[PDB]
Amino acid sequence: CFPITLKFVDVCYRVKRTILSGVTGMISPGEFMAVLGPSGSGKSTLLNAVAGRLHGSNLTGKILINDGKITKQTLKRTGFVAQDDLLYPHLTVRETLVFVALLRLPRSLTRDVKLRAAESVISELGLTKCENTVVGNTFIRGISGGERKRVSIAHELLINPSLLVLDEPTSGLDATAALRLVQTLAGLAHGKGKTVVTSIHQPSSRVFQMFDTVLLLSEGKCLFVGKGRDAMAYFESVGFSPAFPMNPADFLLDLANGVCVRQTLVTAYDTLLAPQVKTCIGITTCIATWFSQLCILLHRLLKERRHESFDLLRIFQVVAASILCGLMWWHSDYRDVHDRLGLLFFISIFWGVLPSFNAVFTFPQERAIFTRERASGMYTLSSYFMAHVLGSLSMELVLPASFLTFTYWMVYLRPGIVPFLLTLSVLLLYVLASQGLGLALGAAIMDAKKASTIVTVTMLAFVLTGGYYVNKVPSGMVWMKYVSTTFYCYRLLVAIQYGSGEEILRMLGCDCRFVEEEVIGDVGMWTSVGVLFLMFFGYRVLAYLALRRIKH
């Protein structure tokens, strides 16, 4: 049993405005202190300066975890439940808390110890009768808002903390769900010997009955500390009583808001209670934990990258483009050299626009969950990036491989096993090379509407210079095809279906320079392959360096 006594002595916090000034108190092992105050009084700045997420020059004052300063050994026993709940919406409640248990608990334990620690906090917080329910956010409909907060508390109870610092847990709940939530926070402060500190926004009449001690901030100058049942007995002494039946938490916020008065209760506290508050004061251990962090992060996000890959409005978009492409070029003749190349350029526009546009929403949408979880240990951005690289290498190759299996034998392309699997290999390498353009642009620009416009303009300049629409490019724009991804896929597709124009010039008898300039071209088959590999790796190295630059 390691309990924490906590004492902050005269904490100040300016920002460039004074938010906190002279806040002093103590929090004991085994008490449930609630921090009351109006909005903009400095409640949430006091919780961040106590949990340890704020230190520097803007802060001023001694914050003492068990008579000593805050070192990083204490932060493993200190939890902070922030105001917003960032959970993946397709995992169940048991799946959410088991993946967090493997990632957060140390690797000295077995996989059965770290699995029984995740089904103990399910029974502690009362999540047993929803443990197979999907979490959901607003569209993947799941657990309630009062059980979404209990999952976010269970993230911080898996490491068994001694000081649990919550930041407005009862905001947005009922009067019943917000009473039962405080009934459990009072449970694991009187039975577990913990030290719970919270900040309630507007307590009801019997939520306020459950507080051991109350700290009341006016606009950053600490009107009252002490017990909750002795709150209005102190204000009767200075001469402030309610004139009608009030909730005692309503009467306190009306003193801190100027409706009853602020300066008269600063000088009353500073001479009567603020005096005596001072009186009680390797290559198999560096590598194996990366490949286990990767293996859990890849198995966790399989369900996330399954509804953003096999969306039923994206399967329909590829089923429709297979039937249309399969009907317009149905039983096509390879001696029509102009329509066979417009088929192979439709495959290059469709499978460069569709992967690069969908990949640009991947990193903006997970910036908040990655920031909260990387700062909490739990991974190191290179096992997070390499689980998004590998997790979308596997899922994004099922729809282009089913487009081509359908529309290769109906369209009468080049018959055989080796012409089929060379066309399939070039199409899958082009989907992965163009997907990384969307990853590198969505990570450099962490907005998703500002980056869907730059990947639209880039894919339009890639298609216009890709080899088919314009044949007489002006002399100052012939360089732009060499940076184009579409130019190297389309030159490879024509080289598989036609070769070096030898059989087609015999059958056409044109050996009329139409088929010498469109089927042979400029780049070889190995220069075209080795630039689609340089754009595979190179557009994912640029997406990693973009994500280092954010700080998150």
- Which residues in this chain contact a second copy in the complex, by CB under 8 A? 38-39, 174-176, 202, 204-206, 209, 232, 242, 244-248, 250-251, 253-254, 257, 313, 316-317, 320-321, 324-325, 327-333, 336, 338-339, 342-343, 346, 449-450, 453, 456-457, 460-461, 464-465, 469-474, 477
Residue 192 assigned ligand-binding role: no
Nearer to ligand Y01, 99 or 345 (CB): 345
Residue 221 assigned ligand-binding role: no
Distance of CA 433 to the CA centre of its chain: 24
Nearer to a second copy, 507 or 541 (CB): 507
Part in contact with ligand Y01 (CB under 6 A); list of ranges 126-134, 251-259, 282-290, 457-465: 457-465
The span from the CA of 436 to the CA of 444, in Å, is 12
Nearer to ligand Y01, 185 or 440 (CB): 440
Taking CB within 5 to 8 Å according to partner kind, which of a second copy, ligand Y01, none is near residue 15?
A: none
Nearer to a second copy, 209 or 289 (CB): 209
Residue 44 assigned ligand-binding role: yes
Taking CB within 5 to 8 Å according to partner kind, which of a second copy, ligand Y01, none is near residue 14?
A: none
Tokens (6 digits) for 49: 């300066």
| Cα–Cα separations (whole angstroms), residue 277 to 216, 224, 252, 426 | 15, 11, 20, 74
Taking CB within 5 to 8 Å according to partner kind, which of ligand Y01, a second copy, none is near residue 353?
A: ligand Y01
Applying the rule CB under 6 A, the residues between 294 and 313 that interact with ligand Y01 are 311, 313
Nearer to ligand Y01, 312 or 418 (CB): 312
User: What minimum distance in Å lies between the beta carbon of 318 and ligand Y01?
Assistant: 10
Size of the site for ligand Y01 (CB under 6 A): 17
Residue 364 assigned ligand-binding role: no
Nearer to a second copy, 328 or 421 (CB): 328
Q: Which residue of 354, 492, 493, 546 would you call a contact of ligand Y01, by CB under 6 A?
A: 354
Does position 392 interact with ligand Y01 (CB under 6 A)? The reply is: no
Nearer to ligand Y01, 378 or 439 (CB): 439
- Coil, strand or helix: which one is 231? coil
Q: Of 466, 330, 463, 309, which Cα lies nearest the Cα of 401? A: 309
Tokens (6 digits) for 107: 């690797």
- CB distance 217 to 42 below 8 Å: yes
Q: Which residue of 53, 210, 257, 346 would you call a contact of ligand Y01, by CB under 6 A?
A: 346
391-412 burial, b for 16+ CB within 10 Å, e for fewer?
A: bbeeebbebbeebbebbbebbe
Residue 120 assigned ligand-binding role: no
User: What minimum distance in Å lies between the beta carbon of 213 and ligand Y01?
Assistant: 52
Residue 392 assigned ligand-binding role: no
Tokens (6 digits) for 535: 């754009």
For 552, residues 6+ apart whose C-beta sits below 8 A from its C-beta are 367, 370, 371, 374
Does position 349 interact with ligand Y01 (CB under 6 A)? The reply is: yes
E strands in 218-369: 224-227
Taking CB within 5 to 8 Å according to partner kind, which of ligand Y01, a second copy, none is near residue 30?
A: none
- CB distance 41 to 256 below 8 Å: yes
445-471 burial, b for 16+ CB within 10 Å, e for fewer?
A: bbeeeebbeebeebbebbbbbbbbeee
- CB distance 23 to 49 below 8 Å: no
Taking CB within 5 to 8 Å according to partner kind, which of a second copy, ligand Y01, none is near residue 471?
A: a second copy
Write out the H or E segment, with its range, that includes residue 9: strand 6-14
Residue 462, CB half-sphere, CA atoms under 13 Å: how many? 24
Nearer to a second copy, 320 or 507 (CB): 320
Part in contact with ligand Y01 (CB under 6 A); list of ranges 90-98, 347-355, 373-381, 415-423: 347-355
User: What minimum distance in Å lies between the beta carbon of 454 and a second copy?
Assistant: 9
User: What minimum distance in Å lies between the beta carbon of 425 and ligand Y01?
Assistant: 22
User: What minimum distance in Å lies between the beta carbon of 260 and a second copy?
Assistant: 11
| Cα–Cα separations (whole angstroms), residue 308 to 302, 303, 315, 382 | 10, 9, 11, 22
Does position 460 interact with ligand Y01 (CB under 6 A)? The reply is: yes
Part in contact with ligand Y01 (CB under 6 A); list of ranges 148-156, 385-393, 430-438, 459-467: 459-467
| Strand arrangement, sheet containing 213-216 | 78-81, 163-166, 195-198, 32-36, 213-216, 224-227
Q: Regarding beta strands 224-227 and 78-81, do their DSSP bridges make them parallel or antiparallel, or are they unpaired?
A: unpaired
Residue 248 assigned ligand-binding role: no
Position 175: which residue type?
A
Nearer to a second copy, 2 or 482 (CB): 482
Residue 43 assigned ligand-binding role: yes
Tokens (6 digits) for 124: 């502690």
The span from the CA of 134 to the CA of 42, in Å, is 36
Place of tokens 């399989």: 302
Residue numbers at the binding site for ligand Y01 (CB under 6 A)? 311, 313-314, 317, 346, 349-350, 353-354, 357, 452, 456, 459-460, 463-464, 469
The annotated binding site for ATP is made up of 37-44
